């Protein structure tokens, strides 16, 4: 039985618990893991403060070349707009790219906006102020986001960019997805990007969103599989899921990552942490399902398991996988 520690991306944090309560249960390995979101998660890692690190936002092949670390996919999630607007459903309003940039640029104040209004023409929409939320926190979450943002809404592109931190025109800070939904909740009006879970577990309203080939989509954890429908990952595990091409692909979609040394100076914590990930693709894809995460596809668990095999050494140079 080991103890081992994680930190990082909030994203997949409750499959992350999940998985960790139900692998204790059947074999007495403990994982801690704390949400601390992504970029916090590279800095542990990098720090060896933890065993592995999680980030929803891909280091490059030179970055991990750079520190020594390997990284991997472990689920698909998808990022909604979770919205506090009395008198609305779930899943009934609409909105599309240009349209949520416009939000988020702080150009669109209230919900009964005539550009919401065209987009939703059976809606009665109340003439409510929109309270705009955002990360206050270094957030694969805003990575993922604003990339879908800057490909859909050129003035976003242009003035704010694409990062895990960057300078919002407007909106409330909330620390991890759990605080945005918080704010979310406690506000008439507002408007939160969220991983999937959040909005669902907080029984939170989300939108529907208009995918890259022009059609309105309901996020879904088939949704976000059908987003990953063409990613080519033979190439790479850094696949962006933003705004892509298919039928029914919900456009702010995205996998996320575990990072680990190449050399583990605690060999013994590596192969555990390689078999806990290891029993999570065997075992533990309906628990991820459950919580409406798309699983990776098996050759991709696969890919994984044939770069364990030449990436994961100890100091000696022998594999750990
Ligand atoms: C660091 C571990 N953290 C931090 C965020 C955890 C741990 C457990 C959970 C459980 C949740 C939860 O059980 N929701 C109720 C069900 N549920 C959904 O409907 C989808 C995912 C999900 O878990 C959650 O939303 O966030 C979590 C977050
Ligand atoms: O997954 P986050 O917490 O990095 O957004």
């Given at each position: 039985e080991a103890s081992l520690t994680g930190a990082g991306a909030t994203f997949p944090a409750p499959v992350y618990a999940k998985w960790a309560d139900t692998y204790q249960k059947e074999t007495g390995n403990k994982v801690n893991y704390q949400g601390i979101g992504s970029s916090g998660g590279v800095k542990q890692i990098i720090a060896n403060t933890v065993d592995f690190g999680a980030s929803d936002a891909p280091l490059s092949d030179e970055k991990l070349a750079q520190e020594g670390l390997f990284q991997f996919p472990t689920v698909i999630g998808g990022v909604v707009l979770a919205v506090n607007i009395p008198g609305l459903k779930s899943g009934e309003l609409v909105l599309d790219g240009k349209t949520l940039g416009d939000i988020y640029l702080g150009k669109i104040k209230k919900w009964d906006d005539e550009a919401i209004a065209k987009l939703n023409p059976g809606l009665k929409l109340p003439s409510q102020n929109i309270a705009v939320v955002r990360r206050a926190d270094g957030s694969g979450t805003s990575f993922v986001f604003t990339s879908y943002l800057a490909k859909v809404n050129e003035e976003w592109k242009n003035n704010v960019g694409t990062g895990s931190t960057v300078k919002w025109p407007i909106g409330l800070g909330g620390k991890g997805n759990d605080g945005i939904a918080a704010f979310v909740q406690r506000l008439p009006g507002a408007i939160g990007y969220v991983e999937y879970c959040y909005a669902k577990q907080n029984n939170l309203a989300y939108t529907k969103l208009i995918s890259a080939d022009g059609k309105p989509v309901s996020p879904t954890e088939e949704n976000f599989a059908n987003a990953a429908?063409?990613?080519?990952?033979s190439k790479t595990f850094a696949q962006d899921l933003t705004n892509?091409?298919?039928?029914?692909?919900?456009?702010?979609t995205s996998t996320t990552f575990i990072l680990i040394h190449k050399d583990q100076k605690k060999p013994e914590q590596g192969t555990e942490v390689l078999k806990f990930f290891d029993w999570a693709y065997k075992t533990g894809a309906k628990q991820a399902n459950d919580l409406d995460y798309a699983s990776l596809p098996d050759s991709v668990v696969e890919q994984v398991r044939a770069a364990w095999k030449t990436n994961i050494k100890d100091s000696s140079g022998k594999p750990l996988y």
């Open positions: 429908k063409g990613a080519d990952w892509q091409k298919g039928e029914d692909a919900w456009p702010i």
